[PDB]
Design a protein around this nucleic acid. Structure first.
Length: 114
RNA sequence: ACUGAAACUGUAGUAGAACCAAUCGGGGUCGUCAAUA
């Protein structure tokens, strides 16, 4: 198997509901009908996890070596932004949302002609 | 055909109230490349 694939992003004309496009609920108050609060999540790694510290990247012969990023206690610092992007892309898949990061795709692509 | 004198423009009053320098973003990842003869 190829190590990547694609969940199809379906067109969203006539999507009419919470999965549709909508004005956001806002931040001003907790709406009586909408849920707020804290979810506690246990994350456990199944395969090894890479958390590169680019701030400490050793470079020799233009080859970069990354240590694990660690917090003030010396345990691995898994960044919340890394979890957020994992969660967002998975969320955006299963809700068939907009593509949040779709950058620089307005030129035609090039290949060897016959 | 004799200069008036003497008298503090001072006294009281806070350049201040309000406003989050902030919103979104996994330090990530795979197919060639080159154009003649």
């Amino acid at each position: 198997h190829n190590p990547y694939n694609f969940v199809p992003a379906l067109p969203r004309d006539g999507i009419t509901g919470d999965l549709g496009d909508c004005a956001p609920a806002g931040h001003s108050y907790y709406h009586g009908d909408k849920y707020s609060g804290r979810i506690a999540v246990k994350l456990t790694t199944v395969t090894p996890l890479l958390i590169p510290d680019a701030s400490k990247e050793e470079i020799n012969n233009n080859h970069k070596t990354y240590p694990v990023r660690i917090g003030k206690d010396g345990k691995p610092y898994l960044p919340p932004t890394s979890i957020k992007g994992m969660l967002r892309s998975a969320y955006e898949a299963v809700t068939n949302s907009r593509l949040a990061v779709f950058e620089d795709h307005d030129s035609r692509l090039a290949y060897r002609m016959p």
